[PDB]
Amino acid sequence: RIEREQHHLIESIEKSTQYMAKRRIGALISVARDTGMDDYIETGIPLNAKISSQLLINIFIPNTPLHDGAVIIKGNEIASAASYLPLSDSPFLSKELGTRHRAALGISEVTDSITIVVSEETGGISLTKGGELFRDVSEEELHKILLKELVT
Numbered sequence: 001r002i003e004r005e006q007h008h009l010i011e012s013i014e015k016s017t018q019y020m021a022k023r024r025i026g027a028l029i030s031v032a033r034d035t036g037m038d039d040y041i042e043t044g045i046p047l048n049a050k051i052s053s054q055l056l057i058n059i060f061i062p063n064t065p066l067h068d069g070a071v072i073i074k075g076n077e078i079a080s081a082a083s084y085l086p087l088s089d090s091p092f093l094s095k096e097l098g099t100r101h102r103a104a105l106g107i108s109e110v111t112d113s114i115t116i117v118v119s120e121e122t123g124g125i126s127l128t129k130g131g132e133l134f135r136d137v138s139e140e141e142l143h144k145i146l147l148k149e150l151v152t
Ligand SMILES: Nc1ncnc2c1ncn2[C@@H]1O[C@H](COP(=O)(O)OP(=O)(O)OP(=O)(O)O)[C@@H](O)[C@H]1O
Pocket: 026, 027, 028, 067, 068, 069, 070, 083, 084, 085, 086, 087, 097, 098, 099, 100, 101, 103, 118, 119, 120, 121, 122
């Protein structure tokens, strides 16, 4: 069922970001929806891989060929890793945040994608949607947002 797929995706994101946040492993994971992401998938290394927390983690290990860029998730696949997302030029984004967050914000401005960031400098988990930044959300907060947004 798609329902079981969507819940597995939530769990996959929750576990991998939780693992990566404890270890300050930067990460950037964009989930596409009605708005196509195919142009950005094509900038990356194709994976077309089953979604799992273990793969998400392995991708973002630092100084590895897959980690520099965004993971894009399309349907029930990790479509691509090391993809480019457009950067927000928004002057409202805090300057202590980094390029991952600016990239997470840029794509949320031009798609309806849900994107999730792990800061390598703080371990905070953030989320972007519709040009909004949810900064350093708690585990419970991330759970409800992903539940609300990714389960249809
Ligand atoms: N357009 C983009 N799309 C996706 N990833 C990007 C883009 N531009 C930069 N990145 C990623 O942003 C990271 C920038 O590395 P850098 O050493 O500058 O850390 P940083 O931006 O301070 O980190 P953080 O935001 O996690 O605190 C690199 O992984 C680079 O792959």
